[PDB]
Design a protein around this ligand. Structure first.
Ligand SMILES: CN[C@@H]1CCN(c2ccccc2F)C1=O
Ligand SMILES: [Zn+2]
Ligand SMILES: [Zn+2]
Ligand SMILES: [Zn+2]
Length: 459
């Protein structure tokens, strides 16, 4: 049991206004046939156009919300809306395009999906709130068959070209006109009461209803993300490497060690309250400080209220020493904090649009993160870049240009001239730092933090 059986029942109540008289008793097998597709009893990797909720979650990077509204049924124009904000008008003869025949509309669909998905996934999952016209419009831009590979590479085929009779992945599909072997899921099958807008608006105020197909496409995908990543959370699901995941994660570990070690050296806190991941390890194992851990899983819905984390009776005195909130999203950080907070607004292949201002950050695991809020940091300041090292000035074991920098906090720089080892380490650290920042992470610190206090650790 890994794929959705074509013999599974499909509830047709949501389809009966666009498709009156539709049988109540319906399987995916009969629905696919009604949609104009023929599966021919084929054991060639594509057993069903529709997928399970579990398969959808594993392929969240492929999710594209899709809605079709009757602009005026083979006689009337249709408005095709996608969660990319694109609206296309197809004539049978928030971007809004004028009415065009299907032969040109399909070319645009292939281009749009290929540009959106080439760096995210090997497929497309059309996320629907199915009412009928979206399912019956698929025959005009979708072709199905056995699983195939690209004509220019080893990736699976996602597009087909009627001009050349060839197949391509999202990277090699320029000029292609058909979407090939797409996947889809109807959110209405999950058991909801009431329409799309009433269910979406229970959890999100950021997506409105401008009464266009793309607005519905966006709401449908948002509702699906809420159900699968906000109200339900699964950290056992692994996702493939598609970008700088490893470098970002290594950079995060380096920056955490650097910043915490320097805060302990500069202000000599007697106790550190480490709030967050219950599997956290001391990031500065050699520090003398009394290290105390507090368990809090990553919040996926709203940011934690500092009152619930700290109060209701632990050192108890979180006001003593310093608090470390490394990716532990809270409404308002205390003044004595060291913080790393993911900025949900960041544009990247790892960060997908989410629910209610939040974003779905996918790096090995999927983490829905509450919307970034500048007011959470009112008691702190932005942590400036610096590099600190107490290691001996010794090269050991890549060419050189001497380093001159006021932020290279080392014995050699204090002495007037940065050594080769600390210049190499400073540059590697600055690269790791910029990688983590560009990935969306923001760093905040207690207002008294001053790197000038680090120079006297060299005596
Ligand atoms: C006497 N206290 C020692 C001095 C060095 N130190 C320390 C070392 C590495 C990282 C952070 C630190 F605070 C202490 O805790
Ligand atoms: Zn290819
Ligand atoms: Zn929404
Ligand atoms: Zn040095």
């Amino acid at each position: 049991p890994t794929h959705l059986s074509v013999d599974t029942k499909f509830k047709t109540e949501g389809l009966c206004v666009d498709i009156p008289g539709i049988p109540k008793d319906m399987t995916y097998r009969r629905l696919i046939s009604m949609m104009g597709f023929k599966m021919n009893y084929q054991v060639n990797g594509y057993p069903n156009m529709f997928i399970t909720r579990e398969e959808a979650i594993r392929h969240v990077r492929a999710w594209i919300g899709f809605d079709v509204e009757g602009c005026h049924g083979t006689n009337l124009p249709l408005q095709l809306g996608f969660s990319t904000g694109v609206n296309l008008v197809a004539v049978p003869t928030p971007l809004m395009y004028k009415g065009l025949p299907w032969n040109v509309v399909r070319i645009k669909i292939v281009q749009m999906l290929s540009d959106t998905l080439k760096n995210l996934s090997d497929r497309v999952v059309f996320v629907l709130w199915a009412h009928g016209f979206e399912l019956t419009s698929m025959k005009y831009f979708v072709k199905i068959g056995p699983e195939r590979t690209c004509c220019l590479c080893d990736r699976r085929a996602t597009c087909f070209s009627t001009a050349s009779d060839t197949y391509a992945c999202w990277h090699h599909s320029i000029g292609f006109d058909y979407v090939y072997n797409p996947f889809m899921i109807d959110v209405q099958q999950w058991g909801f009461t009431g329409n799309l807008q009433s269910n979406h608006d229970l959890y999100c105020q950021v997506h409105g209803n401008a009464h266009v197909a793309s607005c519905d496409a966006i709401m449908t995908r948002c509702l699906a993300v809420h159900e699968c990543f906000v109200k339900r959370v699964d950290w056992t699901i692994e996702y493939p490497i598609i970008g700088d995941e490893l470098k970002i994660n290594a950079a995060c570990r380096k920056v955490q060690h650097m910043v915490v070690k320097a805060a302990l050296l500069a202000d000599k806190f007697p106790v550190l309250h480490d709030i967050g991941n219950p599997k956290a390890i001391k990031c500065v194992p050699q520090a003398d400080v009394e290290w105390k851990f507090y368990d809090a899983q990553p919040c996926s819905d709203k940011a934690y209220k500092i009152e619930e984390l700290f109060y209701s009776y632990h050192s108890d005195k979180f006001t003593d020493g310093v608090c470390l909130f490394w990716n532990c999203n809270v409404d308002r950080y205390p003044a004595n904090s060291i913080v790393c907070r993911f900025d949900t607004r960041v544009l990247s292949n790892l960060n997908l649009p989410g629910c209610d201002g939040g974003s779905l950050y996918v790096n090995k695991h999927a983490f829905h993160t509450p919307a970034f809020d500048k007011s959470a940091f009112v008691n702190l300041k932005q942590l400036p870049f610096f590099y600190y090292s107490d290691s001996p000035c010794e090269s050991h074991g890549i060419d050189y240009v001497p380093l001159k920098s006021a932020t290279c906090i080392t014995r050699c720089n204090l002495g007037g001239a940065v050594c080769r080892h600390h210049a190499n380490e400073y540059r590697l650290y600055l690269d790791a730092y910029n990688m983590m920042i560009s990935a969306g992470f923001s760093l905040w610190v207690y207002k008294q933090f001053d790197t000038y206090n680090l120079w006297n650790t060299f005596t």
